[PDB]
Amino acid sequence: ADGVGNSSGNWHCDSQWLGDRVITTSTRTWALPTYNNHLYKQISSQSGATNDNHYFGYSTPWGYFDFNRFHCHFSPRDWQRLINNNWGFRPKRLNFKLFNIQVKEVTQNDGTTTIANNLTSTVQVFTDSEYQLPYVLGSAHQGCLPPFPADVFMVPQYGYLTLNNGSQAVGRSSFYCLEYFPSQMLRTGNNFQFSYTFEDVPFHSSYAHSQSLDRLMNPLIDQYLYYLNRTQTASGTQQSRLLFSQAGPTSMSLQAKNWLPGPCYRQQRLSKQANDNNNSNFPWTGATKYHLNGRDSLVNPGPAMASHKDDKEKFFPMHGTLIFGKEGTNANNADLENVMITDEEEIRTTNPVATEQYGTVSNNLQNSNAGPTTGTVNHQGALPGMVWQDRDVYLQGPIWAKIPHTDGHFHPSPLMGGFGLKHPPPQIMIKNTPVPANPPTNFSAAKFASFITQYSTGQVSVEIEWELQKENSKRWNPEIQYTSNYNKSVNVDFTVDTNGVYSEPRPIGTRYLTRNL
Amino acid sequence: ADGVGNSSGNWHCDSQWLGDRVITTSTRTWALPTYNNHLYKQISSQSGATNDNHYFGYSTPWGYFDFNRFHCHFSPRDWQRLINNNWGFRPKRLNFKLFNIQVKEVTQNDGTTTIANNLTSTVQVFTDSEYQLPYVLGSAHQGCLPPFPADVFMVPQYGYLTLNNGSQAVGRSSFYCLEYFPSQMLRTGNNFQFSYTFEDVPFHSSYAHSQSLDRLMNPLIDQYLYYLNRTQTASGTQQSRLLFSQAGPTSMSLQAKNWLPGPCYRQQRLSKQANDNNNSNFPWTGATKYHLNGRDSLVNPGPAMASHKDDKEKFFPMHGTLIFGKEGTNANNADLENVMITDEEEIRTTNPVATEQYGTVSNNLQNSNAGPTTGTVNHQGALPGMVWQDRDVYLQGPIWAKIPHTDGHFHPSPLMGGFGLKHPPPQIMIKNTPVPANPPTNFSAAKFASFITQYSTGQVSVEIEWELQKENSKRWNPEIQYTSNYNKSVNVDFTVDTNGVYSEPRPIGTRYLTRNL
Amino acid sequence: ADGVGNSSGNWHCDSQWLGDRVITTSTRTWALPTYNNHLYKQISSQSGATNDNHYFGYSTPWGYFDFNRFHCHFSPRDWQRLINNNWGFRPKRLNFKLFNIQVKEVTQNDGTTTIANNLTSTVQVFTDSEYQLPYVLGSAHQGCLPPFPADVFMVPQYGYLTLNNGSQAVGRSSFYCLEYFPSQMLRTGNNFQFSYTFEDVPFHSSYAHSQSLDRLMNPLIDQYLYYLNRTQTASGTQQSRLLFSQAGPTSMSLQAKNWLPGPCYRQQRLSKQANDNNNSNFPWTGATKYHLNGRDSLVNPGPAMASHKDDKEKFFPMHGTLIFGKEGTNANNADLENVMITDEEEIRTTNPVATEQYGTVSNNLQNSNAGPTTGTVNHQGALPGMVWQDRDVYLQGPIWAKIPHTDGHFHPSPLMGGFGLKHPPPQIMIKNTPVPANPPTNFSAAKFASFITQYSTGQVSVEIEWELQKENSKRWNPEIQYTSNYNKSVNVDFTVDTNGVYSEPRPIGTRYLTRNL
After folding, report:
1. Distance in angstroms (rounded) separating the CA atoms of residues A71 and A91
2. Contacts of B111-117 spanning 24+ positions with Cβ under 8 A
3. Which of A400, B86, B301, C488 is least crowded, fewest Cβ atoms below 10 Å from its Cβ?
4. What's the helix, strand, coil split of chain A in %, to 5?
5. C-alpha–C-alpha distance, residues A239 and A233, integer Å
6. Residue A215 to residue B267, Cβ atoms within 8 A
7. Coat protein VP1/VP2 Parvovirus domain: which residues (chains A, B, C) (predicted)?
């Protein structure tokens, strides 16, 4: 509704704080290539892949837009305003736009490449509102919008997996032609828009607890409930006798309590200091993992559990945390100093430590002849009276995941983090419409393999409205805040360098402010 | 709004039964001292305390009122009317009052102490409505209102715990000044009141089941479903063969069933007869316990599980039940005959026995060479198809607990018993306002350490409205009731003795009437 | 709202005189390149830079428009009408436009460069209305609109500085992404506009004083106030005696006066004749300078002070005046004849001479033994009773500056000249939107370094409304006017030469008409 010479949109990047809510908007420039020559191709694992790694699926010519990382929507300063001042947040609604679209045709002769406007060429866009396609967003892939608004990103290619037996397929395997969906077709001067409203979801926990689960008592007062203090006589000839006391300040571990820690599935502990770890290769063998249909899948990061106990910070659970990486880090076999390993430390007060046993139970019936023996609980499922915390969310990381559609689920919170949505934000699909090269002058029923090489660029705006939960605390003393360091440095954190490269020094989490259990 | 010579309230102790509901009211006389010289003091575990017993916290000059035991609100006869006639009950609303307040100043000269009315002195009261302070009520401490209306009780001192590393504190540790809250100030002739409404909560189960979970079948009729009767040939040369029968009256254990017993976390079994228990000291070592942040906390009483199986009554799970004590019982190393150990026997029909394994699972894949082996399940978390019962409530015992504020919880029923409330009855805080002694005649900026010694007494009324669930049963035969014994005795149960001491002979529970699964 | 073939604006260059006000409008053609490859880069001083010269900052891909020189808005004839006929002027409102925008793509093959219209490419524009970005306008940089309407100018690159320690940065250093602001995006056929209203500001002084500050008296009449004429006896034996006279025509220097000259911060005097200056290099060492945070910053031009006293015109204060340069002058180590040094001579009547002491004060208490000694005041801050003049404004020179936002300021008039504005005219920011080159055909998450080379050109209109203060003078005799010389010359002043180069022969100031103190 514009034409060649009128812009179809404007650049809105700002954030807006109304104090009950914050509305963050991001506009970015994208570049969409032609994927796999306008073809749907089936893909599968090769021979020699282990049983665990086999897959079967389809790659599509279509691309897709992914805003599902937080730093897309928040600047490091806007993230600080949120995490320092608030006990929780959730998304409300979003608004999406594609505008200022440009389709460029590319010709190559000799070594000289030539790029030109193709003014009549079209790009296709549809959002999947009814969740009919396989939903790949919640898998924490790349291709999401950049953190930094001046970066130009490449739109990732869409592809999906279905059932496989080995590297083959079964009869239930679904094939989806995305051409089989209604999609808006846009020339330069056409724009795309849609709106989305998040379903009701719990606020995230932007707080840490000011009390441990087992410390909820009154330190001054004794209980009126007795516990068994002694199974044997105190002094004299040792003899079996049952003696009962009332627990109190001096023994807190012995008191009766109303609640249990959350469930655990135990992790292997790793030291960050070199040579304090066993010499052997055991990321896979010593791993905690689940088993489906013959395949062992690593449990990563897994159920939310504290990363380490008190003054253990040098240790982290193996596969039990999110691990980011520094700008410029190699994608294969990077050193510990290159990656940024996150920390669950705040949830010590409720969730078990990932590397420690849940507890201990008795495995026998004792008697005068048989002494009591007790077994160790490495894994525990939900018991009545458990209370736990979800894994934290970071500036870098999943905002949401799609809850799988199944008969049942238990506490459907995504294990990488974020919000579980039955109806998440839909997938936005985009491809370049094929433009044939010159046909032969005699009819041929063969399909066209000959296409004009072209790509498209444009602008993409995303606007999310977030609801805030303000901090009500009465504590007298000050609270921990997320702060920059005042000491001088060559580079400012969360900033470009001399070469124009934007980097993030650390994985900022959302839990600073405190709250009582 | 009265003055020195007008009473600010009346004594309402009665109970009222409207048959859908019961309204119980209790009025008691209290005495409030000055705690720790009007000072907030930090408290912590000493050196030599084990890692499990360390704590860090604050003791406050403030006292608090706790009505959270049932016998506060119910007489033994009113408790009998409830448990014999009803399938369930829950609280609806409560009303609280402080009135007829008296502040007494105390002077000591030589050995003679003198007490006098201080008519202008004030007492401070605030209820914490917004749950901003650490909530110590649900820990089953002492200082609750007496069972017997003619007893005068001392108001317990308030104190709380926060995060600790060892006996030290971390940066997240919260300090709360209760002076930093608005509070009503009362002289003699001022009174205090507030109202509270309980949130919707399930009725407690005042019933026991008339059927075991695995007996729900029809004893007359066979099933149409086959089960595997034989993995080997019946007679002749022994040979592998699979033989299938239909389960029926003769084998009930073999039938298909729709439901599983509730989850277990296993306990060590103790005998009440002397010398049938192992000779060794294992209350701590042989204990079932959980693990948070490096500390082992005893699991008491824990997930609801039957105390003993059939005709095992001489046994009880170690730490797996509530244990009260008789009037006059020592608070340390009391004999088995002094304590009153409660019993979960009614929940046999659903919940597993606390001292027995949940069941057995197969640990291997058998073949012709490898015989089947099977492992024992000592602990089990929630499985689909589990049905269980909550722990019973007793005349002596927690009415409610505060559900911790966390991202998730599983079946938030307090494990000592009672109702889990997100917004429980608020804390009522009270202290004596400091009255300085004579200042020096020259200005000094030092704080006053010199105070007029004084205490306050008064009257406290609590009125709770309880909703009742009537018994609809069609069973022909009579039901078990809670009854007194007609045989003659020196003392009447639930009565004062010759010395004026009120005692409770036994821990009356609420489960008598029966209901089908 | 036009398209490819419709112009989005017209050329308005005229000036309009309504006699209370003048409305000047300027339209110019601009060319905007791509700055530093669409990248934000941090910049800092090198090693070997002196402590005084260190800096830390950021260069941005954005350009900006600067109209802040007067000759942008005034022709030499319009400037003459203003300065000859008026006692003062101030700006009222302005109106800004960008129109007729053209984005050109550039390709290079062999040595042949090719330029073509890119019709769908966009340029981004935002004005900073809320003063959120660092404001670089008032620093008298280049890149301002040309004096002469037929010149085409290049839009200057935007960059800013922040805190530094040496060449490094501290934690308070701010980074601003200009992409993080809402900006209008324009293709060819879109135009940009905004309006601005100047805050109330004093008229500039277009006048010189007809009286010196110390000559305000009546030359005919004596004062009634005595002064001390003699501290010693007139004739005879010399003896201490105090003798008092009345000042009058014969001694004007001795009269009582109500006012003091303005404040001074003293300058070093330089001779325009060669060899009358000391032989040594002392622009930095003999300089008057201030000191912040360890760095010596030259004071230029500094507090407004007369350039020279009577018949001293061959001298000028070092760093104490504005210095322009002739067309074609080298930017480094230009000779005195190439530069145009301005003159503050008109303010002699109030402001002190920049190269002379403010005055003299007594440094001791005299007595019969101790003779009076007196010290010289080289620098003086505000005293009660001071009256001064601001530095003059020139056809070439700053119109305004932004008053820094601070707790306090004293007489916030910019020291280079012009009007101090708390809310100055906003910054207008512009850049070329990045257009990616052809992406790879397989997804890569690396940022694009590959861009289509392109630049944009267009038209820029600025319209300022100026308020005039008419000359009311009653003086009989004629007044000094700014006039051209009638004698013949090769080139006309304020005109192009044979080669088409526009030059300005002299720095015309605004102070001609006279006014009494």
Report:
1. 14
2. B117/B188
3. C488
4. 5, 35, 55
5. 5
6. no
7. 1-490
Q: Minimal Cα distance from A408: which residue of B? A: B384
A to B CB pairs, distance under 8 Å: 398
Neighbours of B194 (CB within 10 A): 17
Beta strand B21-32 pairing with B454-470? antiparallel
Q: How far is A412 from chain B (nearest CA, A)?
A: 10
**For residue B148, which of B506, B499, B494 has the smallest C-alpha distance?**
B494
How far is A349 from chain C, CA to nearest CA, in Å? 33
* Residues sharing a CB contact under 8 Å with residue A27, sequence separation 6 or more, in sequence order: A11, A12, A13, A149, A459, A460, A461, A462, C179
B324 and A226 within 8 Å at the Cβ level: the answer is yes
Instruction: Provide the strand spans (E) within B248-326.
Output: 260-261, 264-265, 269-271, 289-292, 295-298, 315-317, 323-325
> What are the phi and psi torsion angles at A51 (to 5°)?
-50, -35
Amino acid at C107: T
Alpha-carbon torsion angle B34, B35, B39, B41, nearest 10 = 180
CA distance A133 to A128: 7
The burial of B114, by beta-carbon neighbours within 10 Å (0-12 exposed, 13-18 middle, 19 or more buried), is given as: exposed
In angstroms, the separation between the Cα of residue B312 and the nearest Cα of chain A is 13
Q: Which residues make Cβ contacts (< 8 Å) with residue A343, sequence separation at least 6?
A: A307, A308, A313, A316, A321, A509
Report the first-to-last Cα separation within chain B, whole angstroms.
Answer: 57
The SS3 call for residue A215 is helix
Residue of B58, B135, B174 to mutate, interface with A, max A Cβ within 10 Å? B174
**Of all helices (H) and strands (E), which one includes residue B82?**
helix B76-85
The span from the CA of A99 to the CA of A186, in Å, is 9
How far apart CA B98 and CA A513 sit, in angstroms, is 36
Q: SS3 of A151, please?
A: coil
Q: Which helix (H) or strand (E) holds B80?
A: helix B76-85
Q: Which residues of A touch B407 (CB under 8 A)?
A: 202, 205, 388-390, 413
Instruction: List CB contacts (< 8 A) between B292 and chain A.
Output: 212-214, 261, 348-350, 352-353
Instruction: Please enumerate in sequence order all residues whose Cβ is within 8 A of that of A341, keeping only pairs 6 or more positions apart, or say none.
Output: A272, A316, A321, A322, A323
Burial of A143 by CB count in 10 Å (0-12 exposed, 13-18 middle, 19+ buried)?
Answer: middle
Nearest to A429 by CA among A124, A1, A109, A88: A124
Query: Do you find a cis peptide bond into B425, omega within 30 degrees of 0?
Result: no
Residue C12 CA to residue C22 CA, distance in Å, equals 15
Choose among C13, C18, C17: nearest CA to C97.
C13
Cβ–Cβ of A157/C443 closer than 8 Å?
yes
**How many separate helices (H) and strands (E) can be counted in chain A?**
2, 31
Q: Do the Cβ atoms of A223 and B416 come within 8 Å?
A: no
Contact at CB, C187 and A6, closer than 8 angstroms: yes
CB-CB under 8 Å, A113 with C439: no
Q: Which two tokens stand for residue C503?
A: 């030059």
Structure tokens at B202: 């399930």
Chains with 3+ CB–CB pairs under 8 A to A are B, C
Backbone angles phi, psi at C53, to 5 degrees: -100, 0
Taking 3-state DSSP, the helix, strand and coil percentages for chain B, each rounded to the nearest 5, stand at 5, 35, 55
Q: Distance between CA C24 and CA C91 in Å, rounded?
A: 11
Q: 3-class DSSP state for residue A138?
A: helix
Closest CA to C283 of C332, C317, C329: C317
Contacts of B373 (CB under 8 A, 6+ apart): B362, B363, B364, B366
Name the one residue in this structure whose structure tokens are 């010693």.
C232
Nearest CA in chain A to B128: A474
Nearest to A480 by CA among A129, A84, A30: A84
